[PDB]
Ligand binder design. Structure first.
Ligand SMILES: COc1ccc([C@]2(C#N)CC[C@@H](C(=O)O)CC2)cc1OC1CCCC1
Ligand SMILES: [Mg+2]
Ligand SMILES: [Zn+2]
Length: 326
């Protein structure tokens, strides 16, 4: 069908920053995570490398995608697909050429796919403040991130869903550890320490004559993967403005809905969650200035000069958002 042909054409840009992820979500019948993951696995020859039966991969992907909520505006399957594809592009940076093994690549992509699964559309702090079952289970620390991991791994046990069935025991153990380390690093309470450590790595980074990073031990390798997926998670403001503005609309819808739940419970409304007292544009500029730019500038220094175009787009978008403030 024409819809299937147009979907294939859009997916030809899977290796590019700025993939039309919303259009792909529409054309795939709201299956962006499944089609983008399948495309990336084929592009990187992961099915052959890890002997993953195609039917097993598709079954797991559709199951995982089903566990993202269709009624949450931001933290849904489209965001997961976007983070997966962004991680996929970041793994292809010239400065990281042949740095990571196929198992590490598999771990980063898998982590990205499951990193927000079963997200309820409310924050860790909301879950702690409302004495939720999730906060009780996880003792108030990385509440959602622990849950995303637990769900992502548990789904591998469903019928014809174990995509890692042909990995050795050693490989399975290593992948599990890496995936946990990466997803737990997506918790924003860890951002400042993660960034501080990334800056320290950049100060004494070792590279070849071509500028390829030299990472020997697990601590340094996982640190780069953690920051890579964190960057992918915080990549909305570095995307073409047309995409970024859609992500902004979605996060604000989610925040306002949380604020509505807080108002219904008589709680103090969280910052940027009050639809009656919101400054959307000022908030995005602040997000860029205090979180996104500091992170991306540091990543750009690590892989210099491969991230220059991403940084250029970020700066263009900050300038535009600022211009909308009278
Ligand atoms: C496009 O805008 C945003 C996209 C993502 C985020 C998040 C951050 N930080 C929201 C919080 C989320 C988390 O803490 O898990 C991680 C992602 C925040 C964004 O903007 C902020 C929140 C409200 C306005 C500014
Ligand atoms: Mg998250
Ligand atoms: Zn996320």
């Amino acid at each position: 069908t024409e819809q299937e042909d147009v979907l294939a054409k859009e997916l030809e840009d899977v290796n590019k920053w700025g993939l039309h992820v919303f259009r792909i979500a529409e054309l795939s019948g709201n299956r962006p995570l499944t089609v983008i993951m399948h495309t990336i696995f084929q592009e990187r020859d992961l099915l052959k490398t890890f002997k993953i039966p195609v039917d097993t991969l598709i079954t797991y992907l559709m199951t995982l995608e089903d566990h993202y909520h269709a009624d949450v505006a931001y933290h849904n399957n489209i965001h997961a697909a976007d983070v997966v594809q962004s991680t996929h592009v970041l793994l292809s940076t010239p400065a990281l050429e042949a740095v990571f093994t196929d198992l590490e690549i598999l771990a980063a992509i898998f982590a990205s796919a499951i990193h927000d699964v079963d997200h309820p559309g409310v924050s860790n702090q909301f879950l702690i403040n409302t004495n939720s079952e999730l906060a009780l289970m996880y003792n108030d620390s990385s509440v959602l991130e622990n849950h995303h991991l637990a769900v992502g791994f548990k789904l591998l046990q469903e019928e014809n869903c174990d995509i890692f069935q042909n990995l050795t025991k050693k490989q399975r153990q290593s992948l599990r550890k890496m995936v946990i380390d990466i997803v737990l690093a997506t918790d924003m309470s860890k951002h400042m320490n993660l960034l501080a450590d990334l800056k320290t790595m950049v100060e004494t980074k070792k590279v070849t004559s071509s500028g390829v990073l030299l990472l020997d031990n697990y601590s340094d390798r996982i640190q780069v993967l953690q920051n890579m997926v964190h960057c992918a998670d915080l990549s909305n403001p570095t995307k073409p403005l047309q995409l970024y503005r859609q992500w902004t609309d979605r996060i604000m819808e989610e925040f306002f809905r949380q604020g509505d739940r807080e108002r219904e419970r008589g709680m103090e409304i969280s910052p940027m969650c009050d639809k009656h007292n919101a400054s959307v544009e000022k908030s995005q500029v602040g997000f860029i200035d205090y979180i996104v730019h500091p992170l991306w500038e540091t990543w750009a220094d690590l892989v210099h000069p491969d991230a220059q175009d991403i940084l250029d787009t970020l700066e263009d978008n900050r300038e535009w958002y600022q211009s909308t403030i009278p």
